[model samples]
Target: AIIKEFMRFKVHMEGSVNGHVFEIEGEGEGRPYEGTQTAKLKVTKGGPLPFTWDILSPQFSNAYVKHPADIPDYFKLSFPEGFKWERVMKFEDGGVVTVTQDSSLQDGEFIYKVKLRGTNFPSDGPVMQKKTMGWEALSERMYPEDGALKGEVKPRVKLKDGGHYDAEVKTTYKAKKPVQLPGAYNVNRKLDITSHNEDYTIVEQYERAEGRHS
Candidate 1:
């Protein structure tokens, strides 16, 4: 009997926080200050060799006591430092698939490091890979405490073998000190960041129903 299977996986995450902006270098600096910021990894068996990473920011906003600069130019965002996330699924006979993501704030920029690999597959050898994605301006902006910054990854597939798998990973970051901005103008603000990842896969057991050979 012929076997047919199908599956779908999706991962979505969101982050939100409050922040402010101020004159960077002017002595009128007011002697007072304040602060604030996913990428989806879609994967599946028999899917494209390189997984598609689509980042979506559906809802994002901020409120400044004073409109220090153009809203778009003043606010910057990205994953926070020491931020770690990963997902894993097991296949038949020592076959395993997994993805790991790490984030850091480097030199006023947000950086995300990603790794995807299929190890000890019954039908093939290990597939190894890695990719880096980023967001700019860590020192020049603040995030929305009430608004959301989000990312999602979705992978749909049909498997030859009958089976199913699902996964999810979530993370968050909160800044004790406001993010400091230094430039012609400055506005410092604190940030709270959140990330949510969800995924699932299923293979139709046509062979089992048909009573195919073991």
Candidate 2:
């Protein structure tokens, strides 16, 4: 989400949710999908500075629901997207997620409270999500080390049966002294993500490469 004033804003509200991953034995109607259940309520007068506090259509979503699928095809399933979780994770069956923004703001706050009835969708009105993760540390891996900064937030994650996970991420950055490859900074940049979820842990290391991404 890119707004014009870029830095002159404040996000007082909350939370993509790239969807989570589960599994399935056979193929069926509810194949693989993504979902998220979270929201942000914040506000600021001006001089923005990105999220944390300001009036905005808070996005309540997460990736705690993925089945047979790790992420989205074009994009990862999670909040701000319409897919399902309770129907995807393949625990009991398939799942799904729906989204509708209520641009109504009161005192710079938007209260999001939705209920789901047993039946097909809309036929019973709109349904919301359950619990969720902050997924903060996923991005904080680089802020503080650059200087003028300090961080102590754990990256957020979710597992199969709807479990929220959190942990600190250690990052290693290496920069090439001068020019080299055509795409790369001729310079270099690297980031390593070490996430320790309750049941298991995920570790991913990356070395800088320019242009295309794999």
Candidate 3:
């Protein structure tokens, strides 16, 4: 049985929260400046990994967009400090995932590369010989448009004894309105691993000064 609870963002236990993005992606995602997404999180219990969690965000809105400067000139939505996330893929055997992003401008279009790796698991017993069971994230099929983002992920998982499995994980996120702020603007994201996808909606709402929204 899995469990979840609401909690603050900061990591009460430090050290592990290095300025790292995703180990498999290499070169941590330059931070503090900008470029990150935020949302409420949930923790999974009785799961394969000791540290298992999920992302959940509030419904879409365009109240903040009214403030132009609040947006960025580029595309790097900054997530809050001490923000952590994990992926636990459930299949017949199960696998862990490491998701990373590489953002760039292509043909004047905001393009970001997401690399996903699924490995480890069978915690109780029957581990694998090769390190990674399988993983991947391709460019052409997926990308983000104005206020909408989609991913047509194709995860190739190596089976226990012989062959492999070509799995399709399709996901999408459409904000009530497209963000066009200052640096980089994005409010939500969703991922479908093995058909049953997990969505991570992001946001940066009104701050200490209560403002307006509709």
Candidate 4:
């Protein structure tokens, strides 16, 4: 037997910075920053499934302006207590690196994406130093039948020297049967936040399909 229905699904994102928490509620409507988003889904005739997810927001700080002597303190505070720097890369005018958890599922991953524009330098005009940085994470949980999460993060920079440079990073995660959910016939997809950087962030989007029974 096969059953089909126009099931509606919703997704929401929320987080905090420096103890100031914010939650983007999901309204089941396709609106940005409205705290509510919806999608269609289908369920099979079976048992319960276990799922969990975390939505991470981009962490931003102005420590770059501090002197080199204070850089260590800034880095420690920017990262969680006992965090370790995983990767570091140098850019034209500035550079970026990431610090992450020791036993986290996303550990060792490029948990942070940093960018420094030439305009950030003093020699560059105030307008030229206009720089911005951000980070994002996709939903950590999703239903089994829900489609995969896909997107790209690309940051564009206008150097104080009158040259423009574009830097981008792409990320994708395919949907599959989670090992933790065993003997569960029906799988409901949920959103999960993993990692991202400034310029662009990956979001959760899903589509549904009907169930078939034999």
The C-alpha TM-scores of every prediction are 0.25, 0.18, 0.28, 0.22
- Give the lowest summed-lDDT range of ten residues in model 1: 24-33
Best candidate (score: lDDT): 3
lDDT of 1 by residue, 5-88 (tens): 121112222211111111110000111001111122222333233221211121111111133333332222222332344445
Q: Candidate 3: where is the Cα deviation over 4 Å?
A: 1-44, 48-132, 143-147, 175-177, 180-214
Give the per-residue lDDT of model 2 (tens digit) for 1-214. Answer: 2111111111122221112222111100111122222221221122222211100111221112231332122112111222221111111111222222222212322223221112221221112132232232233212223321121223344433566534342322212121111111111122222232232222112112111121
How far off is residue 54 in model 4, in Å?
Answer: 19
Model 1 scores a TM of 0.25
Candidate 2 — worst ten consecutive residues by lDDT sum? 23-32
Best-to-worst lDDT order: 3, 1, 4, 2
Between candidates 1 and 3, the one scoring higher on lDDT is 3
Point to the candidate with the largest TM-score. 3
What does candidate 3's lDDT look like per residue over 131-194, in tens digits?
Answer: 2332332221334455444434454544456565444444443332244323223332222222
Worst 10 residues of 3 by lDDT: 11-20
Q: Report every candidate's CA lDDT.
A: 0.25, 0.21, 0.27, 0.24
lDDT of 2: 0.21
Decide which is better by TM-score, 1 or 3.
3
Error of 1 at 102 (Å): 1.4
